[PDB]
Amino acid sequence: MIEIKDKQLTGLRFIDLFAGLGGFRLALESCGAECVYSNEWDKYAQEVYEMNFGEKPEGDITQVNEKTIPDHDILCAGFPCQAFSISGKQKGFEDSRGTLFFDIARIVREKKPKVVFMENVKNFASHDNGNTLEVVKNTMNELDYSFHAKVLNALDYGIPQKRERIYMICFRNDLNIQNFQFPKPFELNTFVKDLLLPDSEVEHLVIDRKDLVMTNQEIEQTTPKTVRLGIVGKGGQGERIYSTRGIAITLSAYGGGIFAKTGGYLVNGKTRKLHPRECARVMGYPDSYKVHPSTSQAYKQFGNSVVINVLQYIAYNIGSSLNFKPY
DNA sequence: CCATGCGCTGAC
DNA sequence: GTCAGGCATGG
Numbered sequence: 001m002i003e004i005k006d007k008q009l010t011g012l013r014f015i016d017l018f019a020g021l022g023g024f025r026l027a028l029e030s031c032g033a034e035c036v037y038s039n040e041w042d043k044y045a046q047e048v049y050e051m052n053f054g055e056k057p058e059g060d061i062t063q064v065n066e067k068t069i070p071d072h073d074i075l076c077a078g079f080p081c082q083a084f085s086i087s088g089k090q091k092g093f094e095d096s097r098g099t100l101f102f103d104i105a106r107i108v109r110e111k112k113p114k115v116v117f118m119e120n121v122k123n124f125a126s127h128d129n130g131n132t133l134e135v136v137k138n139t140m141n142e143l144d145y146s147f148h149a150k151v152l153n154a155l156d157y158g159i160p161q162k163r164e165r166i167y168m169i170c171f172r173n174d175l176n177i178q179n180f181q182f183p184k185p186f187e188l189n190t191f192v193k194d195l196l197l198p199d200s201e202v203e204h205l206v207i208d209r210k211d212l213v214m215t216n217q218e219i220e221q222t223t224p225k226t227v228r229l230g231i232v233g234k235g236g237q238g239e240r241i242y243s244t245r246g247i248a249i250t251l252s253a254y255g256g257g258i259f260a261k262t263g264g265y266l267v268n269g270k271t272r273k274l275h276p277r278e279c280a281r282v283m284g285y286p287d288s289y290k291v292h293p294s295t296s297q298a299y300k301q302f303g304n305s306v307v308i309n310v311l312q313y314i315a316y317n318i319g320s321s322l323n324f325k326p327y
Numbered sequence: 328c329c330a331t332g333c334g335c336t337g338a339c
Numbered sequence: 340g341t342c343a344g345g346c347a348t349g350g
């Protein structure tokens with residue numbers, strides 16, 4: 001994550017729904033905002049959140065009376081994406097994990113925050129012939145919000161990961177916000193190799209498969225793209241090896257393969273998974289952030305999470321818009 | 328709970 | 340054709 005000198009969101013209150021690791025919290029707090037409520041139902045996510053922020057999020061949002069939620073200015077929600085991902089069944093709103101947006105809508109209707117700030121997978125914009133996104137837009141419009149949606153790739157915002165997500169920013173109509181812009185992409189100057197731990201700290205992550213097939217030469221020149229170097233097995237998910245001189249493939253939460261959740265990388269002549277701290281860095285988490293004691297849960301958590309830096313630029317622009325109030 | 332081989336998908 | 344992006348089942 002980056003340093004934010006001008007605290008655009010000072011004095012504003014936010015809630016952290018589907019909190020996970022608290023990526024939205026780190027991003028908005030860096031812009032000066034104050035968290036007043038958090039909600040997350042996974043036992044291990046609750047633990048890591050408490051380890052980092054000192055508080056246990058409330059559980060199952062579907063059973064929370066929306067009237068009990070504190071007054072707030074910005075509602076944040078990176079809501080579940082399994083039902084919308086191209087790696088899943090794409091049942092969408094028909095999936096029990098696919099109806100959480102309607103809980104967001106229920107809370108917005110009651111609490112009427114200035115801003116609603118949501119994140120999901122890129123496929124959310126395409127799913128069901130665009131109807132899924134249109135449902136969200138229309139729901140927010142019906143609640144008297146404007147709707148701004150764009151897919152952003154983390155590699156365009158200083159983080160070496162291909163991670164294309166949809167970001168949906170909504171302003172209450174009475175605020176007359178007409179100048180919200182998504183942040184402009186800029187040149188990437190950091191690559192996977194720049195975020196790696198020393199070899200001595202990751203020896204246990206080395207995998208030596210005799211069915212490794214190298215399909216492409218290692219590169220010496222860094223590049224802002226994924227660079228496949230080889231495969232093991234049949235080369236499905238988690239069975240693909242990439243160059244550290246490129247960017248990381250997207251981290252996953254429920255993924256498998258021998259290099260599960262992180263993918264495999266060529267490091268000093270050997271192939272290995274990423275360490276959870278390398279996952280944190282690939283998601284823009286600061287080294288001060290405390291990783292969950294279970295490595296399996298840590299990988300799941302980072303796989304579900306948000307890239308802090310992207311959220312910081314967006315949050316800064318939300319604040320920039322709210323603050324422009326000429327006579 | 329933790330581990331891993333898929334077996335498809337959207338987008339080229 | 341290519342490549343990046345959760346489910347099922349094993350224990």
Ligand SMILES: Nc1ncnc2c1ncn2[C@@H]1O[C@H](CSCC[C@H](N)C(=O)O)[C@@H](O)[C@H]1O
Nearest residue numbers: 018020021023040041042060061078304305
């Ligand atoms: N009914 C529910 N109540 C509370 N949390 C829920 C929920 N259904 C799913 N979730 C949680 O919603 C999260 C979506 S992933 C969100 C990750 C978060 N943005 C971060 O910064 O890490 C998951 O952690 C999942 O456990």
